[PDB]
Design a protein around this ligand. Structure first.
Ligand SMILES: *[C@H]1O[C@H](CO)[C@@H](O)[C@H](O)[C@H]1F
Length: 440
């Protein structure tokens, strides 16, 4: 029934998805500015140029967090505002903005949980191969140092990267996210340099920190289940599990890259000398789990890598874009608790998209999103009962925002955003979360 008294209850955003003000106060160009302004890349012709205008309206966002009774806010810092050239001088005006934001959050009793990298790589670094270059890992660590020196007197909880699998595989292999390349070797090289940048940044942040910090990384994880017990289907499930989950979990845990995936990738695998792997395994103080769906895998030898296709379950509920399987959150947390060394754990992203509209009465009656939260929170109680060291939960997202290649057309907020007027309104699910948290 009851969560621990000191549990962290928050909502989460990312800078490019909400901030707007893309040319203000010295901000440089990110890969997502370039990508969203490329014809045909965004489903609805929108960009993040304005988004929720949270660069100017973060006070309203704080008012929403307060109205919801949250005690934490997970947000990201835009590297293009801090080091507009990617590698080069700092932009003090960008640091001052986030310093004021942090003070406003603390004044409201909200603990900041800061993500350093949520996909907005400075374009000048992509012009020099982006995450395909080891140099980008080095300058990411320099950026991390700069930010912790100025904000680490007030922010204790930091994550280096959000979802490196997406940055590497969607951005460099499948081409659906910025920068939009379509080359497997590039994607795997990017995955290595992202992990190396994480490891270098952890060490840089600890040396620059004015006080002890709690440093983590945030991974999207997908529990995978074979469609049958045949050797082919079980092997497909293992391959998909390696492709998404173990490729990142194992090196972070000091276990190297998984050998079965190295064999499967062959010559496309990155060159990883042991010195890099030692750096990648820098000790972490927590791990963030982003959880949305499961994968029920069937062998697909004709399909592209990793030759495993999803077996849709038409009996399960579906949102605007995903299948709902709350029990997979329990499964993945138990697996992490039993099989990997990371603890404590936070749920850093959990939420769903729906075709939300404002009803005649003025509210947003998003019953499926309420049911989504209720079902996933029940699985967290089961995980806690099993001894999983869970310390907090962040709903994705505080407000409807720019959903990457889907644009403004895919609403994940617990608050509704009118993109024409920038008004925010709490959805029914947000009031349910408020009242549930108040009961705790
Ligand atoms: C986690 O997934 C959500 C929904 O696709 C994205 O909006 C976040 O940026 C990502 F971190």
């Amino acid at each position: 029934e009851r969560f621990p008294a000191d549990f962290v209850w928050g909502a989460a955003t990312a800078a490019y998805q909400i901030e707007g003000a893309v040319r203000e106060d010295g901000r440089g160009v990110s890969i997502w500015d370039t990508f969203s302004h490329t014809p045909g890349k965004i489903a609805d012709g929108t960009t993040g140029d304005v988004a929720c205008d949270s660069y100017h309206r973060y006070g309203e966002d704080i008012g929403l967090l307060n109205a919801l009774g949250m005690n934490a806010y997970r947000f990201s810092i835009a590297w293009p505002r801090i080091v507009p050239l990617g590698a080069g001088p700092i932009n003090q005006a960008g640091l001052d903005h986030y310093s004021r934001m942090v003070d406003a959050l603390l004044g409201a009793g909200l603990q900041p949980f800061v993500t350093l990298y949520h996909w907005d790589l400075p374009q000048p670094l992509e012009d020099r191969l982006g995450w395909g270059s080891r140099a980008t890992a080095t300058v990411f660590a320099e950026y991390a140092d700069i930010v912790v020196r100025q904000l680490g007197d007030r922010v204790t909880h930091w994550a280096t990267l959000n979802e490196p699998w997406c940055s590497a595989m969607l951005g460099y292999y499948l081409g659906v996210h910025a920068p939009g390349h379509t080359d497997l070797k590039r994607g795997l090289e990017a995955s290595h340099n992202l992990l190396l940048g994480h490891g270098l940044a952890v060490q840089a942040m600890r040396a620059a920190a004015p006080q002890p910090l709690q440093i983590g990384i945030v991974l999207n994880l997908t529990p995978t289940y074979p469609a049958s017990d045949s050797p082919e289907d079980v092997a497909a499930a293992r391959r998909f599990d390696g492709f998404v989950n173990r490729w990142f979990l194992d090196p972070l845990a000091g276990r190297g890259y998984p050998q079965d995936m190295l064999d499967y990738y062959g010559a496309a695998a990155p060159q990883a000398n042991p010195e890099d792997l030692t750096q990648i395994a820098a000790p972490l103080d927590w791990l963030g789990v982003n959880y949305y769906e499961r994968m029920r895998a069937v062998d697909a030898p004709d399909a592209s890598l990793p030759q495993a296709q999803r077996l849709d379950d038409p009996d399960l509920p579906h949102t605007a874009d995903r299948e709902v399987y709350p029990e997979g959150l329990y499964d993945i947390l138990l697996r992490l608790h039993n099989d990997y060394p990371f603890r404590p754990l936070y749920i850093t992203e959990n939420g769903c998209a729906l075709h939300d509209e404002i009803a005649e009465d003025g509210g947003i009656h998003d019953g499926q999103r309420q049911a989504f939260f209720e079902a996933h929170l029940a699985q967290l109680q089961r995980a806690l009962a099993a001894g999983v060291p869970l310390k907090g939960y962040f709903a994705w997202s505080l407000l409807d925002n720019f959903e990457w290649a889907m644009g403004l057309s895919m609403r994940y907020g617990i608050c509704y955003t009118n993109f024409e007027t920038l008004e925010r309104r709490i959805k029914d699910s947000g009031y349910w979360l408020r009242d549930f948290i108040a009961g705790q």
